[PDB]
Write a protein that binds this DNA or RNA. Structure first.
Ligand code: NA
Ligand code: NA
Length: 93
DNA sequence: AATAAGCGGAAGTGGG
DNA sequence: TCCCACTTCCGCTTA
Protein backbone atom coordinates (compact mmCIF):
# COMPACT_ATOMS: atom_id res chain seq x y z
CA UNK A 1 0.00 0.00 0.00
CA UNK A 2 1.00 3.61 -0.66
CA UNK A 3 2.88 5.43 2.08
CA UNK A 4 1.40 8.56 3.66
CA UNK A 5 4.12 10.90 2.40
CA UNK A 6 3.56 9.63 -1.14
CA UNK A 7 -0.22 10.03 -0.87
CA UNK A 8 0.35 13.68 0.07
CA UNK A 9 2.94 14.32 -2.63
CA UNK A 10 0.61 12.78 -5.23
CA UNK A 11 -2.28 15.01 -4.08
CA UNK A 12 -0.09 18.09 -4.41
CA UNK A 13 0.86 16.99 -7.93
CA UNK A 14 -2.72 16.37 -9.08
CA UNK A 15 -4.35 19.34 -7.35
CA UNK A 16 -7.45 17.21 -6.72
CA UNK A 17 -7.88 18.63 -3.18
CA UNK A 18 -6.44 22.12 -3.67
CA UNK A 19 -8.78 23.54 -1.03
CA UNK A 20 -7.38 21.11 1.57
CA UNK A 21 -3.61 21.18 0.92
CA UNK A 22 -1.24 23.42 -1.04
CA UNK A 23 2.42 24.17 -1.61
CA UNK A 24 3.90 27.09 0.27
CA UNK A 25 7.30 26.97 -1.45
CA UNK A 26 7.33 24.04 -3.82
CA UNK A 27 11.05 24.35 -4.53
CA UNK A 28 11.76 23.84 -0.82
CA UNK A 29 9.04 21.23 -0.47
CA UNK A 30 7.01 23.17 2.11
CA UNK A 31 3.25 22.55 2.14
CA UNK A 32 0.29 23.42 4.33
CA UNK A 33 -3.13 22.05 5.19
CA UNK A 34 -6.38 24.01 5.40
CA UNK A 35 -7.70 24.53 8.91
CA UNK A 36 -11.29 24.18 7.73
CA UNK A 37 -10.90 21.55 4.97
CA UNK A 38 -8.16 19.19 6.19
CA UNK A 39 -10.61 16.64 7.59
CA UNK A 40 -11.92 15.78 4.10
CA UNK A 41 -8.35 14.96 3.06
CA UNK A 42 -7.79 12.85 6.19
CA UNK A 43 -11.01 10.94 5.42
CA UNK A 44 -9.66 10.17 1.94
CA UNK A 45 -6.39 8.81 3.38
CA UNK A 46 -8.25 6.41 5.69
CA UNK A 47 -10.49 5.17 2.87
CA UNK A 48 -7.47 4.67 0.59
CA UNK A 49 -5.89 2.56 3.33
CA UNK A 50 -9.05 0.60 4.19
CA UNK A 51 -8.51 1.24 7.91
CA UNK A 52 -11.09 -0.03 10.38
CA UNK A 53 -11.92 3.40 11.84
CA UNK A 54 -12.62 6.75 10.21
CA UNK A 55 -9.37 8.64 9.78
CA UNK A 56 -9.03 12.08 11.37
CA UNK A 57 -6.53 14.84 10.76
CA UNK A 58 -5.18 14.29 14.29
CA UNK A 59 -4.38 10.64 13.60
CA UNK A 60 -2.89 11.51 10.22
CA UNK A 61 -0.69 14.18 11.83
CA UNK A 62 0.34 11.65 14.49
CA UNK A 63 1.62 9.44 11.67
CA UNK A 64 3.37 12.42 10.06
CA UNK A 65 5.19 13.10 13.33
CA UNK A 66 6.98 9.75 13.01
CA UNK A 67 8.68 10.88 9.81
CA UNK A 68 10.54 13.64 11.67
CA UNK A 69 13.34 11.36 12.87
CA UNK A 70 13.89 9.56 9.57
CA UNK A 71 13.46 12.81 7.65
CA UNK A 72 10.83 12.23 4.93
CA UNK A 73 8.59 14.98 6.35
CA UNK A 74 9.45 17.55 8.99
CA UNK A 75 7.10 19.91 10.82
CA UNK A 76 7.74 23.62 10.11
CA UNK A 77 7.19 26.23 12.83
CA UNK A 78 3.88 27.43 11.37
CA UNK A 79 0.41 25.96 11.92
CA UNK A 80 -0.41 22.93 9.79
CA UNK A 81 2.84 23.30 7.78
CA UNK A 82 5.36 20.59 6.84
CA UNK A 83 8.36 20.05 4.55
CA UNK A 84 9.29 17.05 2.41
CA UNK A 85 12.93 16.01 2.20
CA UNK A 86 14.95 16.52 -0.96
CA UNK A 87 15.06 12.73 -1.36
CA UNK A 88 11.26 12.48 -1.31
CA UNK A 89 10.90 15.37 -3.79
CA UNK A 90 13.52 14.15 -6.24
CA UNK A 91 12.49 10.50 -6.28
CA UNK A 92 8.85 11.49 -6.75
CA UNK A 93 9.52 13.70 -9.77
C1' DA B 1 -14.56 28.94 28.99
C1' DA B 2 -14.60 27.51 23.72
C1' DT B 3 -11.97 26.28 20.12
C1' DA B 4 -7.85 24.68 17.99
C1' DA B 5 -3.50 22.92 17.71
C1' DG B 6 0.76 20.88 19.41
C1' DC B 7 3.47 16.95 21.94
C1' DG B 8 4.20 12.41 22.08
C1' DG B 9 4.09 7.70 24.93
C1' DA B 10 2.06 3.35 24.65
C1' DA B 11 -0.42 -0.31 22.87
C1' DG B 12 -2.79 -2.37 18.68
C1' DT B 13 -2.86 -3.75 13.56
C1' DG B 14 -0.74 -4.96 8.70
C1' DG B 15 2.04 -7.28 5.98
C1' DG B 16 5.85 -9.10 5.56
C1' DT C 1 10.23 -13.81 15.76
C1' DC C 2 10.19 -9.41 15.19
C1' DC C 3 10.42 -5.28 12.35
C1' DC C 4 7.33 -2.20 8.91
C1' DA C 5 4.46 1.55 8.63
C1' DC C 6 1.31 3.22 10.51
C1' DT C 7 -3.34 3.39 13.69
C1' DT C 8 -5.64 4.09 17.77
C1' DC C 9 -6.10 5.75 22.24
C1' DC C 10 -4.92 8.60 25.91
C1' DG C 11 -3.23 12.45 28.92
C1' DC C 12 -0.83 16.69 28.95
C1' DT C 13 0.45 21.47 27.02
C1' DT C 14 0.14 25.86 24.42
C1' DA C 15 -2.29 29.57 21.96
NA1 NA D 1 3.93 -0.93 24.33
NA1 NA E 1 -3.13 30.45 17.11
Amino acid sequence: KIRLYQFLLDLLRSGDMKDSIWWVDKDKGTFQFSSKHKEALAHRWGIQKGNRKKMTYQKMARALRNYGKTGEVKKVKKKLTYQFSGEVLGRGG
